[PDB]
Amino acid sequence: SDKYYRSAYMNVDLNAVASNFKVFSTLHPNKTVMAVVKANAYGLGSVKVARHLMENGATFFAVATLDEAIELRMHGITAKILVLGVLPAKDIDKAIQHRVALTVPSKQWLKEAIKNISGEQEKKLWLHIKLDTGMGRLGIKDTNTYQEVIEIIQQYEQLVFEGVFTHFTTEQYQRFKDMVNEAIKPEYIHCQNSAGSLLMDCQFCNAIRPGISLYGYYPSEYVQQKVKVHLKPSVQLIANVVQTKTLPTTIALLPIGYADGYLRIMQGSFVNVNGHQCEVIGRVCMDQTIVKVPDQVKAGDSVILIDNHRESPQSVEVVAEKQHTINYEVLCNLSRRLPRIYHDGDQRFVTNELLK
Amino acid sequence: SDKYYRSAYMNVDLNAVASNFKVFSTLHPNKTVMAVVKANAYGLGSVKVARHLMENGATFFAVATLDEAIELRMHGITAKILVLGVLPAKDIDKAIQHRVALTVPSKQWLKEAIKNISGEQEKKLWLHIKLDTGMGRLGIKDTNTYQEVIEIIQQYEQLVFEGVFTHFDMTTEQYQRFKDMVNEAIKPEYIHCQNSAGSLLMDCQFCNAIRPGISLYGYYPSEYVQQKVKVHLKPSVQLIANVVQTKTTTIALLPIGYADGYLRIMQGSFVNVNGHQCEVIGRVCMDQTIVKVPDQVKAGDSVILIDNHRESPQSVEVVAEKQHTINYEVLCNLSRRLPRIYHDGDQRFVTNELLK
Ligand SMILES: *Cc1c(COP(=O)(O)O)cnc(C)c1O
Ligand SMILES: *Cc1c(COP(=O)(O)O)cnc(C)c1O
């Protein structure tokens, strides 16, 4: 769709994303798969990912913020959408207006949300209650308070107790069941992320929340080792040589740098130039990376910096190890400046945020 | 202008940027100040920054890529624009069509570019030749090739040899090398070698344009430059979030995380919660950050993560030290998900990429 004018880009394999989504629905054929497309689908492009997943049966998405929900709605996503973070109470009408479900983290928040609803928006307010079941970050910890909140919701016909959830293990899961069994059960009961949806069946819940594994990565090497399914990595990060120089070794200049999310710490990494592992030398610049190459490498040759294979020296996890971080952040680092080139069979289309 | 629905954002002070720009033109009254707004003006937002700079006399911008240049043209920018990186030769008509000047890094590139020009685009191709004066990076290192490239340009009425440039005891040799190469051929209209450091520290009688980048935004390229200069620079960026929930030692939850550019390494940093220095504890998550806070801290309290002062424990340089990187990268890391709230006098307007 969009044009692009620099030879540096991500390939995003939508067939891989659909195939990983199908792993989850195949393994839990009686659960709603709430696809987590927060943070711009972990760097891949939430609008195009969410649209593709809807074309592959997805009916419920989760995002981190209301902006992320609205962005989906504005681009024709009609699926159910849950915001996982805490909406500012003043913005309540906007969530009601765009048919966006919200997370209830506390009784205080719910009381404030109610006070901010005017008569202007009159559609249902869909609510999922977040229980803190030990972990200790966002959510309601006491059963009594859980009951109070349900009672407040039932007071208002505009408010819907659509769901209840938590986030992680065995003891915590038991705590979740104990809290939830102390009250009427809502339509959606969910506690599993990617790891949970791969490791545990959890028959008590009727919906799951796979995030990173939809895009083809395990949340940890333990999960990768423990669970004997196959995920398809969806991302390649590619750049073409723009100039070669001899300075007894040839070097190649790539039009990509830390402003694209190829961080300075990548210096000393190896990248893939037509089959050859080539070291990244000298400082990674804002817009340029230098690679030590064999003498036959010329301007126009493609370089794989991130490859769509788990067992690869350019894999996301190896990139994460170089960055002293986790695969999640490597992907989130990839910046707006990179066109995303979506592959769906032999169909190819491009998002380029700079020309929107 | 734009609305936003999460209490995390950047304040961008356009008055500070205009003031820093004025520092450069005051230091160099006889030089064109080619304001570098590449990489979305180092995270500030290239459109809003370039528009503001044009309103304050700026007539020439430099960007990294043609996409960045067309982005400016699409938003009313009429100034000259130079692309500093290497355009794919097949896209040459697009640069010509949009009156964007291009960098010549090599003879080979130039011949490829000329081949791709359509008989039907007949506006000028404005060219700046990049010289490699000792860095062994982008551009022409040999005087004979430089002359050969000029002579090729002279053969085509459609092409203009508009400029020649390079990029920097180390730098004394390079400067002499630049003067020597340029003196061996006809001089073009624009001669330029100085970045922010070069512009703050050197005269360069020979050049007639400068290319300040990071210092336009209020940051020194190094402590050494900060110490040696007699000017003041005004930092232009704050990074702010509000507490969304507190839990009892009181902890505070912030709606910002590593997907926003506040990377996992920020764990153990201190932030400013209404005047109190407070430690980032536990893991920094994709969308959420946990801070140890005084008992009096409540939902809604504002927190400075990056402050607009050089001598602050939340300064961009301190943040860079925590990230084991440089100030440039800290800025570049700040993701599309954060609204930019522009300040210009008492005027305030918001850019929110997700709702664009
Ligand atoms: C991010 C998130 C998920 C998804 O986690 P992954 O490890 O990426 O699968 C699930 N639930 C909540 C509440 C989240 O915030
Ligand atoms: C980025 C850049 C500059 C400006 O560098 P700063 O240190 O940010 O001033 C100057 N010239 C070229 C070619 C650049 O790429």
XYZ file of C-alpha atoms and ligand atoms in Angstrom:
742
model
C 0.000 0.000 0.000
C 2.563 2.692 1.170
C 5.753 3.490 -0.754
C 9.149 3.628 0.965
C 12.389 5.317 0.020
C 15.186 3.772 2.063
C 16.375 0.151 1.749
C 15.836 -0.822 5.414
C 12.680 -2.573 6.540
C 10.933 -5.320 8.502
C 9.287 -8.284 6.838
C 6.219 -9.219 8.856
C 4.902 -12.708 8.091
C 1.135 -12.533 8.570
C 0.824 -16.230 7.601
C 3.120 -17.008 10.492
C 0.983 -14.844 12.839
C -2.238 -16.572 11.706
C -0.524 -19.957 12.062
C 0.603 -19.186 15.663
C -2.885 -17.924 16.523
C -4.212 -21.256 15.138
C -1.841 -23.099 17.495
C -3.651 -21.511 20.413
C -7.180 -22.051 19.124
C -6.307 -25.651 18.167
C -4.974 -26.354 21.661
C -7.979 -24.744 23.350
C -10.785 -25.202 20.894
C -13.450 -24.253 23.451
C -11.837 -21.028 24.700
C -12.040 -17.505 23.362
C -8.496 -16.535 22.220
C -8.111 -12.944 23.296
C -5.225 -11.863 21.039
C -2.873 -9.418 22.824
C -1.978 -6.744 20.244
C -0.889 -4.096 22.744
C 2.209 -1.965 22.012
C 1.432 -1.912 18.284
C 1.283 -5.746 18.299
C 4.718 -5.993 19.965
C 6.224 -3.914 17.133
C 4.543 -5.625 14.163
C 1.709 -3.152 13.555
C -1.467 -3.673 15.569
C -3.914 -2.453 12.886
C -2.664 -4.861 10.172
C -2.114 -7.698 12.609
C -5.527 -7.250 14.200
C -7.161 -7.060 10.733
C -5.420 -10.235 9.603
C -6.322 -12.071 12.784
C -9.983 -11.135 12.328
C -9.735 -12.666 8.834
C -8.539 -15.770 10.667
C -11.437 -15.945 13.143
C -10.202 -13.691 15.960
C -13.107 -12.044 17.806
C -11.525 -10.483 20.895
C -8.416 -8.310 21.253
C -6.643 -6.894 24.265
C -4.560 -3.680 24.221
C -2.666 -1.700 26.859
C -4.275 1.700 26.408
C -7.496 3.336 25.190
C -5.590 5.071 22.375
C -4.596 1.617 21.128
C -8.280 0.546 21.223
C -9.477 3.635 19.386
C -6.722 3.273 16.794
C -8.129 -0.237 16.054
C -11.733 1.019 15.916
C -10.782 3.852 13.546
C -9.305 1.281 11.219
C -12.391 -0.880 10.957
C -11.774 -3.420 13.733
C -15.219 -4.392 15.062
C -14.067 -7.228 17.315
C -14.392 -6.927 21.109
C -11.486 -5.037 22.691
C -10.320 -4.974 26.274
C -7.982 -2.287 27.631
C -5.637 -3.987 30.117
C -4.247 -0.832 31.732
C -6.052 1.702 33.875
C -8.087 4.282 32.046
C -8.098 7.802 33.556
C -11.626 8.240 35.010
C -12.296 11.457 33.025
C -11.994 9.537 29.775
C -14.774 7.060 30.613
C -17.248 8.415 28.046
C -14.801 7.890 25.233
C -14.453 4.181 26.093
C -18.248 3.845 26.236
C -18.498 5.685 22.887
C -16.103 3.353 21.112
C -17.525 0.142 22.665
C -14.263 -0.560 24.509
C -14.147 -2.853 27.595
C -12.098 -1.659 30.513
C -10.148 -3.146 33.392
C -11.327 -2.442 36.970
C -8.213 -2.341 39.181
C -9.855 -1.094 42.383
C -13.173 -0.076 43.948
C -11.936 3.528 44.159
C -11.366 3.599 40.389
C -14.863 2.203 39.684
C -16.552 4.831 41.936
C -14.631 7.588 40.119
C -15.430 6.127 36.672
C -19.144 6.124 37.548
C -19.017 9.781 38.658
C -17.518 10.727 35.267
C -20.188 9.124 33.094
C -22.486 11.859 31.795
C -25.764 11.243 29.940
C -23.964 11.847 26.639
C -22.868 8.257 25.969
C -25.517 5.686 26.788
C -24.166 2.429 25.362
C -23.020 -0.260 27.854
C -19.830 0.073 29.859
C -18.188 -3.367 29.630
C -15.958 -4.155 32.599
C -13.404 -6.859 33.441
C -12.360 -7.045 37.113
C -8.613 -7.558 37.734
C -7.851 -9.682 40.749
C -4.516 -9.495 42.489
C -3.975 -13.136 43.421
C -0.605 -12.804 45.183
C 1.615 -11.232 42.452
C 0.827 -7.771 43.859
C 0.705 -5.134 41.100
C -2.667 -4.031 39.661
C -5.928 -5.289 41.154
C -8.264 -6.366 43.930
C -6.852 -8.567 46.683
C -9.756 -9.208 49.084
C -12.790 -11.384 48.293
C -14.993 -8.951 50.206
C -13.884 -6.080 47.963
C -14.457 -8.265 44.877
C -18.066 -8.793 46.053
C -18.473 -5.065 46.803
C -17.356 -4.181 43.271
C -19.705 -6.704 41.687
C -22.473 -5.269 43.858
C -21.710 -1.704 42.662
C -21.789 -2.805 39.020
C -25.164 -4.536 39.479
C -26.580 -1.245 40.827
C -26.238 0.350 37.363
C -27.913 -1.075 34.352
C -25.406 0.720 32.067
C -22.516 -1.234 33.628
C -21.738 -4.783 32.665
C -19.666 -7.281 34.648
C -18.318 -8.878 31.494
C -15.241 -10.570 32.885
C -12.856 -11.374 35.679
C -9.172 -12.025 35.370
C -5.744 -12.233 36.809
C -2.132 -12.353 35.669
C 0.656 -14.688 36.888
C 1.670 -20.181 40.101
C -0.218 -23.177 41.558
C -1.099 -21.303 44.744
C -2.039 -18.153 42.768
C -4.296 -20.190 40.496
C -6.016 -21.671 43.580
C -6.430 -18.202 45.016
C -8.084 -17.059 41.752
C -10.553 -19.943 41.856
C -11.305 -19.264 45.546
C -12.013 -15.583 44.876
C -14.108 -16.192 41.742
C -16.171 -18.998 43.312
C -17.255 -16.557 46.047
C -19.525 -14.764 43.543
C -21.604 -14.964 40.416
C -19.374 -15.811 37.410
C -19.147 -13.372 34.453
C -19.037 -14.416 30.801
C -15.209 -14.265 30.517
C -12.815 -15.740 33.055
C -9.140 -15.476 31.984
C -5.755 -15.929 33.628
C -3.315 -17.294 30.982
C -0.664 -15.339 29.038
C 1.495 -17.051 26.341
C 3.334 -19.231 28.938
C 0.073 -20.170 30.742
C -1.679 -21.000 27.449
C 1.244 -23.242 26.489
C 1.899 -24.919 29.884
C -1.545 -25.280 31.578
C -5.042 -26.315 30.458
C -6.877 -24.322 33.228
C -10.432 -25.608 32.705
C -11.850 -23.028 35.151
C -11.070 -20.235 32.609
C -12.883 -19.956 29.281
C -10.607 -17.414 27.584
C -6.836 -17.094 27.124
C -4.525 -14.122 26.400
C -1.587 -15.156 24.167
C 0.709 -12.188 23.368
C 4.328 -12.701 22.303
C 3.719 -16.298 21.109
C 1.244 -15.089 18.458
C 4.255 -13.389 16.851
C 6.302 -16.594 17.116
C 8.491 -16.278 20.204
C 8.414 -18.120 23.505
C 8.183 -16.022 26.647
C 11.244 -17.912 27.985
C 13.710 -20.714 27.165
C 12.067 -22.811 29.903
C 8.746 -22.543 28.045
C 10.533 -23.259 24.733
C 12.131 -26.387 26.319
C 9.053 -27.563 28.196
C 6.349 -27.281 25.522
C 6.633 -29.401 22.450
C 4.724 -27.343 19.885
C 6.241 -25.250 17.075
C 5.990 -21.463 16.740
C 6.816 -19.565 13.557
C 8.892 -16.406 14.092
C 7.175 -13.632 12.160
C 9.891 -10.920 11.886
C 12.926 -10.251 9.712
C 14.894 -6.986 9.939
C 16.605 -6.310 6.582
C 18.895 -3.609 5.159
C 20.758 -3.277 1.839
C 24.444 -2.300 1.481
C 24.607 1.303 0.215
C 28.395 1.497 -0.228
C 31.403 -0.758 0.154
C 34.817 0.587 1.014
C 38.238 -0.991 1.243
C 40.220 0.280 4.075
C 43.272 -5.607 4.145
C 39.454 -5.596 4.677
C 36.280 -4.473 2.888
C 33.524 -2.773 4.886
C 29.848 -2.276 4.010
C 27.667 0.648 5.022
C 24.026 -0.003 5.925
C 21.357 2.716 6.034
C 20.052 1.614 9.469
C 20.992 2.714 13.010
C 19.928 3.159 16.587
C 17.058 5.564 15.643
C 15.519 2.550 13.887
C 15.950 0.508 17.082
C 19.233 -1.207 16.141
C 20.802 -0.055 19.368
C 24.448 1.034 19.836
C 25.085 -2.029 22.048
C 24.723 -4.091 18.835
C 28.347 -3.220 17.961
C 30.250 -6.505 17.780
C 27.198 -8.474 16.555
C 27.144 -10.644 13.493
C 24.716 -10.114 10.629
C 23.958 -12.198 7.563
C 25.289 -10.995 4.239
C 24.453 -13.504 1.481
C 25.281 -16.469 3.723
C 28.290 -14.937 5.437
C 28.349 -14.037 9.103
C 29.831 -10.551 9.211
C 30.754 -8.573 12.276
C 29.305 -5.147 13.053
C 32.342 -2.881 13.544
C 32.897 0.603 14.976
C 30.065 2.570 16.553
C 26.480 1.994 15.442
C 25.302 5.450 14.402
C 21.815 7.010 14.457
C 21.177 6.185 10.768
C 24.134 3.973 9.760
C 25.754 0.676 10.661
C 29.137 -0.588 9.493
C 29.820 -4.217 8.698
C 33.149 -6.025 7.989
C 32.444 -7.944 4.738
C 34.087 -10.343 2.217
C 35.506 -8.578 -0.865
C 32.736 -9.723 -3.218
C 29.976 -7.947 -1.232
C 28.687 -4.904 -3.175
C 26.124 -2.068 -2.932
C 22.615 -3.496 -3.290
C 23.184 -6.800 -1.470
C 20.713 -7.571 1.340
C 21.700 -8.072 4.956
C 19.694 -9.974 7.560
C 20.045 -8.335 10.971
C 17.126 -10.153 12.526
C 16.144 -13.481 11.006
C 12.814 -15.341 11.247
C 14.421 -18.504 12.730
C 14.832 -19.402 16.392
C 18.061 -21.395 15.885
C 20.016 -18.680 14.098
C 22.792 -16.281 15.016
C 20.390 -13.433 13.986
C 17.462 -14.733 16.006
C 15.495 -12.308 18.194
C 16.691 -14.111 21.370
C 20.388 -13.791 20.350
C 19.722 -10.140 19.545
C 18.143 -9.894 23.012
C 21.239 -11.496 24.599
C 23.480 -8.933 22.854
C 21.163 -6.148 24.110
C 21.301 -7.545 27.664
C 17.510 -7.730 27.638
C 14.537 -9.950 26.615
C 13.037 -10.681 23.200
C 9.965 -8.563 24.048
C 12.055 -5.383 24.180
C 14.088 -6.114 21.036
C 10.781 -6.128 19.097
C 9.308 -3.057 20.850
C 12.574 -1.181 20.030
C 11.968 -1.359 16.283
C 11.046 2.183 15.422
C 8.334 3.981 13.379
C 10.853 4.842 10.710
C 11.034 1.200 9.475
C 8.475 0.307 6.834
C 6.640 -2.924 7.754
C 6.315 -5.156 4.713
C 3.410 -7.509 5.309
C 3.518 -10.892 3.633
C 0.346 -12.911 3.163
C 1.038 -15.705 0.675
C 2.172 -13.973 -2.498
C 0.417 -10.810 -1.456
C 2.698 -8.097 -0.083
C 1.792 -4.671 1.313
C 3.625 -1.894 3.088
C 2.969 0.373 6.011
C 5.220 3.447 6.166
C 4.252 5.745 9.026
C 6.242 8.707 7.721
C 4.064 9.045 4.631
C 0.694 8.665 6.360
C -5.060 19.481 18.551
C -4.908 15.654 19.117
C -6.611 14.068 22.183
C -4.820 11.402 24.243
C -6.061 8.755 26.633
C -3.217 7.715 28.898
C -1.396 9.771 31.501
C 2.110 9.481 29.989
C 3.544 11.966 27.559
C 6.413 14.189 26.448
C 6.508 17.933 26.848
C 8.296 19.479 23.897
C 9.361 23.093 24.350
C 9.428 24.709 20.905
C 10.590 28.036 22.417
C 13.749 26.294 23.725
C 14.373 24.846 20.261
C 13.991 28.235 18.585
C 16.304 29.726 21.206
C 18.994 27.034 20.602
C 18.658 27.583 16.842
C 19.256 31.318 17.441
C 22.468 30.458 19.377
C 23.850 28.812 16.201
C 22.981 31.658 13.909
C 24.417 34.111 16.435
C 27.709 32.169 16.638
C 27.774 31.958 12.795
C 26.023 35.001 11.210
C 27.496 34.365 7.762
C 26.562 30.692 7.519
C 23.334 28.941 6.516
C 22.109 27.036 9.514
C 21.088 23.658 8.046
C 18.955 22.408 10.928
C 19.180 18.633 11.252
C 15.682 17.222 11.929
C 16.407 13.633 10.942
C 14.960 10.751 13.011
C 11.759 12.728 13.744
C 13.954 15.586 15.070
C 15.686 13.180 17.463
C 12.290 12.146 18.807
C 10.728 15.623 19.217
C 8.644 15.430 15.985
C 10.200 16.691 12.768
C 7.068 18.321 11.305
C 6.222 20.478 14.320
C 9.883 21.304 14.899
C 10.594 22.202 11.239
C 7.400 24.305 11.007
C 8.474 26.157 14.174
C 11.995 26.671 12.889
C 10.741 28.052 9.552
C 8.639 30.523 11.555
C 11.970 31.577 13.139
C 14.043 32.052 9.959
C 15.228 28.520 9.117
C 15.522 28.080 5.311
C 17.437 24.761 5.016
C 16.930 21.341 6.698
C 18.862 18.095 6.618
C 17.192 14.701 7.094
C 18.432 11.081 7.007
C 16.061 9.689 4.383
C 13.778 10.729 1.514
C 10.722 9.551 3.497
C 11.629 12.105 6.186
C 11.968 14.760 3.487
C 8.599 14.007 1.827
C 7.002 13.946 5.292
C 8.124 17.575 5.677
C 6.957 18.595 2.152
C 3.510 17.017 2.816
C 3.143 19.262 5.881
C 3.837 22.639 4.312
C 7.658 22.732 4.574
C 8.908 24.801 1.623
C 12.589 25.167 2.776
C 15.472 23.436 0.985
C 15.889 19.885 2.273
C 18.981 17.720 1.996
C 18.845 13.950 2.419
C 22.105 12.933 4.237
C 21.794 9.191 3.584
C 21.893 7.288 0.294
C 18.700 7.147 -1.788
C 17.940 3.866 -3.645
C 18.772 4.848 -7.246
C 15.353 3.664 -8.576
C 13.571 6.322 -6.467
C 15.411 9.227 -8.084
C 12.303 10.744 -9.790
C 10.650 11.089 -6.389
C 13.462 13.282 -5.013
C 13.396 15.442 -8.151
C 9.566 15.715 -8.063
C 9.629 16.933 -4.444
C 12.636 19.270 -4.855
C 14.753 17.383 -2.328
C 18.545 17.564 -2.546
C 20.474 14.308 -2.354
C 23.853 13.075 -1.060
C 26.285 11.548 -3.579
C 28.322 8.917 -1.766
C 30.099 7.476 -4.804
C 30.569 7.569 -8.574
C 28.734 4.250 -8.930
C 25.671 5.651 -7.127
C 25.629 8.731 -9.330
C 25.689 6.764 -12.592
C 22.895 4.508 -11.303
C 20.843 7.579 -10.307
C 21.267 9.295 -13.660
C 20.135 6.090 -15.442
C 16.875 6.105 -13.481
C 15.823 9.665 -14.239
C 12.613 9.789 -16.382
C 12.513 11.898 -19.549
C 9.288 13.399 -18.113
C 10.532 14.658 -14.689
C 12.521 17.761 -15.716
C 13.006 19.747 -12.491
C 16.621 19.927 -11.334
C 18.449 17.214 -9.396
C 20.263 19.145 -6.620
C 23.319 17.265 -5.376
C 25.649 17.522 -2.408
C 28.790 15.435 -2.687
C 29.841 13.630 0.473
C 33.575 13.376 1.023
C 35.236 10.783 3.194
C 38.032 12.827 4.866
C 39.465 10.140 7.165
C 36.581 8.410 8.932
C 36.511 5.568 6.389
C 32.700 5.780 6.275
C 30.287 7.208 3.723
C 31.500 9.110 0.688
C 34.322 9.752 -1.773
C 37.837 9.499 -0.356
C 39.938 9.996 -3.469
C 40.448 13.382 -5.057
C 40.423 12.003 -8.643
C 37.038 10.300 -8.132
C 35.729 13.574 -6.643
C 36.783 15.426 -9.804
C 35.388 12.662 -12.001
C 32.026 12.916 -10.216
C 31.892 16.720 -10.701
C 32.720 16.355 -14.376
C 29.861 13.836 -14.816
C 27.470 16.284 -13.082
C 28.672 19.057 -15.483
C 27.617 16.927 -18.483
C 23.944 16.933 -17.443
C 22.051 20.187 -17.528
C 19.414 18.574 -15.258
C 22.006 18.034 -12.469
C 23.320 20.651 -10.077
C 26.542 20.396 -8.093
C 24.991 22.296 -5.209
C 27.175 21.311 -2.288
C 30.110 19.404 -0.891
C 30.365 18.168 2.687
C 32.046 15.892 5.159
C 31.397 14.657 8.712
C 33.875 14.591 11.643
C 44.014 16.368 16.452
C 41.869 13.620 14.977
C 39.601 16.341 13.540
C 42.386 18.841 12.617
C 43.767 16.481 9.970
C 40.256 15.789 8.626
C 39.475 19.499 8.346
C 42.728 20.105 6.405
C 41.898 17.028 4.311
C 38.435 18.483 3.559
C 39.977 21.888 2.568
C 42.561 20.231 0.360
C 40.056 18.054 -1.567
C 37.564 20.933 -2.047
C 40.369 23.279 -3.243
C 41.211 20.786 -5.991
C 37.968 21.461 -7.856
C 35.394 24.124 -8.602
C 33.646 25.158 -5.384
C 29.910 24.597 -5.138
C 27.453 27.002 -3.448
C 27.286 25.064 -0.150
C 30.371 23.903 1.756
C 29.717 22.282 5.105
C 31.508 20.131 7.665
C 30.320 21.090 11.136
C 27.815 19.186 13.286
C 26.693 20.509 16.773
C 30.180 19.989 18.310
C 31.921 21.522 15.252
C 29.552 24.451 15.284
C 30.030 25.098 19.010
C 33.825 24.735 19.023
C 35.328 25.695 15.650
C 35.158 28.617 13.232
C 35.732 26.862 9.843
C 36.291 29.976 7.683
C 36.162 27.764 4.581
C 32.567 26.528 5.137
C 29.401 28.571 4.581
C 26.826 26.283 6.140
C 26.622 24.316 9.420
C 24.548 21.292 10.419
C 23.557 21.474 14.068
C 21.446 18.543 15.261
C 21.272 17.401 18.886
C 22.119 20.906 20.249
C 19.103 22.460 18.531
C 17.164 20.292 21.004
C 19.170 21.538 23.996
C 21.769 18.814 24.530
C 25.549 18.789 24.187
C 27.139 16.011 22.119
C 29.607 15.336 25.028
C 30.553 16.683 28.484
C 33.780 17.944 26.930
C 31.802 20.178 24.512
C 29.456 21.269 27.355
C 32.497 22.307 29.440
C 34.363 24.109 26.615
C 31.510 26.234 25.151
C 30.527 29.755 26.244
C 26.866 29.389 25.256
C 23.821 28.126 27.177
C 21.541 25.439 25.664
C 17.949 24.937 26.816
C 16.857 21.288 27.120
C 13.562 20.877 25.262
C 12.162 17.558 26.559
C 10.368 16.343 29.671
C 9.062 12.841 30.051
C 6.057 12.735 32.416
C 3.622 10.090 33.735
C 0.938 10.153 36.465
C 0.549 7.505 39.226
C -2.502 5.351 38.400
C -2.812 3.245 41.579
C -0.911 2.967 44.863
C -0.620 -0.096 47.121
C 0.633 -0.556 50.701
C 5.945 0.592 52.202
C 3.752 2.312 49.600
C 4.294 1.441 45.927
C 3.087 3.488 42.962
C 2.135 2.165 39.503
C 3.011 4.229 36.429
C 1.386 3.795 33.020
C 4.659 3.784 31.087
C 7.040 0.968 30.230
C 9.720 -0.286 27.870
C 7.387 -0.241 24.836
C 7.396 3.541 25.367
C 11.221 3.704 25.378
C 11.632 3.612 29.164
C 13.837 0.522 28.868
C 14.154 -2.408 31.288
C 17.617 -1.183 32.354
C 15.910 1.801 34.042
C 15.265 -0.549 36.996
C 16.853 1.097 40.109
C 16.638 4.600 38.670
C 15.267 7.483 40.593
C 12.319 9.556 39.403
C 10.852 12.793 40.713
C 7.406 12.320 42.286
C 6.230 15.791 43.326
C 9.654 16.752 44.628
C 10.681 13.458 46.202
C 13.362 11.219 44.702
C 11.817 7.735 44.339
C 13.318 4.430 43.257
C 12.120 2.297 40.318
C 11.782 -1.162 41.878
C 11.050 -4.616 40.509
C 11.037 -5.167 36.771
C 10.113 -2.452 34.234
C 7.275 -4.053 32.230
C 6.103 -3.372 28.673
C 3.454 -0.829 29.696
C 3.938 -0.390 33.495
C 6.583 0.817 35.934
C 6.651 0.408 39.741
C 8.039 3.121 41.952
C 8.788 3.109 45.746
C 7.012 6.228 47.081
C 6.363 8.283 50.278
C 3.072 7.443 52.046
C 1.447 10.730 50.880
C 1.651 9.838 47.163
C -1.777 9.168 45.635
C -3.314 8.224 42.261
C -3.058 11.206 39.894
C 0.298 12.525 41.149
C 2.656 13.602 38.367
C 6.144 12.125 38.010
C 9.148 13.406 36.082
C 11.134 10.596 34.467
C 13.194 12.899 32.266
C 13.615 16.553 33.197
C 14.362 19.646 31.119
C 17.507 20.591 33.125
C 21.065 19.537 32.567
C 21.846 19.386 36.323
C 19.052 17.142 37.484
C 19.132 13.541 38.570
C 16.474 13.045 35.833
C 18.533 14.792 33.115
C 18.814 13.086 29.698
C 22.555 12.488 30.374
C 21.953 10.736 33.712
C 19.276 8.610 32.011
C 21.820 7.818 29.300
C 24.393 6.740 31.901
C 21.766 4.411 33.436
C 21.056 3.019 29.948
C 24.837 2.655 29.347
C 24.445 4.765 26.203
C 24.461 8.378 24.953
C 21.848 11.123 25.207
C 21.071 10.812 21.441
C 19.769 7.256 21.902
C 17.729 8.002 24.998
C 15.775 10.523 22.890
C 15.493 8.254 19.849
C 14.123 5.483 22.092
C 10.971 7.475 23.006
C 8.264 5.648 21.134
C 5.380 6.725 18.892
C 3.014 5.712 21.689
C 3.852 8.789 23.796
C 1.916 11.907 22.839
C 4.059 14.964 22.215
C 2.696 18.046 23.911
C 4.187 21.099 22.223
C 4.678 24.319 24.124
C 4.963 27.652 22.351
C 4.256 30.618 24.605
C 0.920 29.974 26.254
C -0.074 27.826 23.269
C -0.149 24.083 23.722
C -0.957 21.442 21.139
C -0.803 17.678 21.101
C 0.387 15.167 18.569
C -0.813 11.564 19.185
C 0.392 9.235 16.459
C -2.070 6.440 17.399
C -5.085 8.663 16.622
C -3.668 10.280 13.493
C 1.073 -8.291 28.155
C -0.026 -9.094 28.841
C -0.305 -10.415 28.433
C 0.509 -11.084 27.350
O 1.838 -11.578 27.791
P 2.778 -12.442 26.824
O 3.824 -12.930 27.731
O 3.259 -11.539 25.759
O 1.942 -13.508 26.223
C -1.306 -11.151 29.080
N -2.021 -10.546 30.102
C -1.769 -9.246 30.522
C -2.570 -8.635 31.645
C -0.767 -8.509 29.888
O -0.535 -7.343 30.252
C 23.318 13.633 12.394
C 24.231 14.432 11.478
C 24.704 15.717 11.851
C 24.376 16.361 13.178
O 25.038 15.697 14.337
P 24.825 16.194 15.806
O 25.875 15.666 16.663
O 23.490 15.738 16.260
O 24.835 17.684 15.649
C 25.567 16.413 10.996
N 25.939 15.853 9.783
C 25.498 14.594 9.396
C 25.938 14.038 8.058
C 24.638 13.881 10.247
O 24.238 12.755 9.914
